[PDB]
Every structure is written in C-alpha cells, then in structure tokens.
Amino acid sequence: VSGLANGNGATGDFAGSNSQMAQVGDGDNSPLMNNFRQYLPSLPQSVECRP
C-alpha cells in the first residue's frame, strides 16, 4: 500500500493495481489527462505588431 503511493511497486495480491496506477501517473504527467490534449481548440500564436 506504501509502494502504490511512493511509486516503488507492489508484489502480492496488490499486483494488479501496478498497471492501473501507471495510468494515473507521477508528477505533472498523467496518461489519463493527456487523452484530453489531442482535442484542444487550436488558438493562434503570437507575432510582432503590424499596422
């Protein structure tokens, strides 16, 4: 239960949730919340000012 939170891993009966907890993620990168990023509205960029 400590290894499914530290990110060290779990061996035993808690060995199925080691692939469910890889989808959650670690830090800023989350495989689950990066599925939403192929569908982001395309906003224009920033260029210098022309009259």
Binding site: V1, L4, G12, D13, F14, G16, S17, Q20, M21, Q23, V24, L32, N35, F36, Y39
Partner: protein, 56 residues
C-alpha cells in the same frame, strides 16, 4: 522429576489447541488483506472507466 501418569499428556494437548486456534487467526487475517486488494482495484477501475466515456 516424578509426576503422575496422565499429566504429561495434558501438557502436550494444551499446546495443540493453542497452535490450531492461532492457525485459524492467521487464515482470517490473510482473507481481510484480500478485501483491501479488491477494494483498491474497484476504485481505480471506476476512474479509468469514466475517463473513456468523457473523452468520447
């Protein structure tokens, strides 16, 4: 150290019951750690499930 004819068998039996009963407590402990495995699994499966609906 002289003793009567039945005392040594009362003393061996009072430690057979103890090991048998302490054997059952182990079996039940292991079962309850299996419930917390099922529970965690379920939760994380419901999250991964909602994701697939919403992104669709």
């Amino acid at each position: 150290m002289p003793v009567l004819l039945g005392i040594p068998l009362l003393l061996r039996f009072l430690g057979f019951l103890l090991v048998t009963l302490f054997g059952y407590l182990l079996t039940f402990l292991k079962k309850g750690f299996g419930k917390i495995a099922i529970a965690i699994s379920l939760f994380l499966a419901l999250i991964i499930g909602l994701n697939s609906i919403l992104v669709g």
